[PDB]
Design a protein around this ligand. Structure first.
Ligand code: CU
Length: 128
């Protein structure tokens, strides 16, 4: 099965998917994030951040509080399973994480932690 997904974040605070399934036969899983919009990171930064559904709002809230200098994630946040950099117009960043960090049954969310983006920029991820 495939163990990679391409995802874009744009100038209208939208991700171009809101559902990812990770095949259980994948040992690693890669996210390729890009930003085909015009706006820079300090205005319309997007990251791909992954947590349990339960942990999402805390990571977002503490992330807002951490500020731009920290890519809007709180330092040493163990709730974050994986994440990309926060990127701006025309940038790219990819990450690969260990699929064994995930667990069958559990619900995961991906989302952007730039202030106010997570209402519109979020989706589910599920080991299947
Ligand atoms: Cu964003």
């Amino acid at each position: 099965a495939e163990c990679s997904v391409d995802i874009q974040g744009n100038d209208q605070m939208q991700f171009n998917t809101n559902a990812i399934t990770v095949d259980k036969s994948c040992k690693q899983f890669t996210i390729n994030l890009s930003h085909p919009g015009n706006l820079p990171k300090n205005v319309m930064g997007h990251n791909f951040v992954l947590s349990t559904a339960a942990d999402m709002q805390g990571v977002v809230t503490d992330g807002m509080a951490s500020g731009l200098d920290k890519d809007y994630l709180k330092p040493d946040d163990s709730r974050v399973i994986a994440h990309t950099k926060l990127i701006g117009s025309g940038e790219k960043d990819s990450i690969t994480f260990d699929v064994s960090k995930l667990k069958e049954g559990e619900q995961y969310m991906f989302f952007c932690t730039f202030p106010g983006h997570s209402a519109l920029m979020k989706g589910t991820l599920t080991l299947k």
